[PDB]
Homo-oligomer: 150 residues x 2
């Protein structure tokens, strides 16, 4: 029940995943709330966008590396194109999850849990990260199942 | 400053900063030119996860080509790999000291603005009058001179 005294501006920004949902509504493509098997044309589209942005990211990394090989000292400002493309890559990665009706935050949270837990393990003498006692793998199947009934 | 003096939920970019603390990795608060070894490592990780995503998409398409209806659970391996790709993509921005949420906000702004334009007869999105591209160089500069953490 909201009222004349209510604050409408939320005190926390939408997530990047929430931004994609808003973007898809804007382009007239309002996407599902729950995991939804896609037609093949949607899967081809998503793969095309990933390949495009991944190719742009690789070109910016290559360009920075070529300049370092030539003896150049990079500046913070030199990173803008790489930063821009890494963000474009997040955009189309989130974009794919959103078009699948899969909440990207819920899946990321489960991956993160497993990765963070693995980070609490010891290192092998050569530096390789080992798993700690009690380690449990990411259960993304369980996450997709929950999302279908939440 | 008193006992009355007394906090938003963590974002995925913030999860990477936490992870990098936990593995003891390079993760400056502000944008920082990386050594070449770091750039080669981030590229390898992107290549690995994007290869894994491509394999899951190819598997789904092959099953659809055979006449199969996919289930929601069939999407679990693809979703897992897309999230792994987010992890190493945010990972790269974090190791660069660049606030991924700040850069993304700016890209979102330009993309959402473009979305408001008309479409060509063939469906191609056009820009509206007054559209402004993403100014990431402006974001980076702001991050260099923002107040301290
Ligand atoms: Mn791009
Ligand atoms: Mn993976
Ligand atoms: Mn920051």
């Amino acid at each position: 029940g909201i009222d004349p005294f209510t604050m409408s501006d939320l005190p926390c920004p939408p997530t990047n995943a929430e931004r994609l949902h808003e973007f898809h509504r804007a382009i007239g493509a309002a996407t599902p709330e729950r995991p939804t098997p896609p037609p093949p044309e949607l899967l081809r589209l998503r793969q095309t966008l990933l390949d495009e942005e991944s190719a742009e990211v690789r070109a910016e990394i290559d360009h920075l590396l070529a300049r370092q090989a030539a003896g150049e000292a990079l500046s913070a400002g030199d990173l803008a194109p790489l930063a821009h493309e890494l963000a474009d890559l997040l955009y189309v990665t989130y974009g794919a999850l959103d078009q699948l009706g899969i909440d990207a935050d819920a899946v990321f949270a489960e991956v993160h849990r497993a990765n963070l837990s693995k980070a609490s393990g010891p290192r092998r003498a050569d530096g390789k990260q080992l798993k700690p006692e009690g380690w449990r793998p990411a259960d993304v199947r369980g996450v997709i199942e929950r999302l279908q009934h939440a």
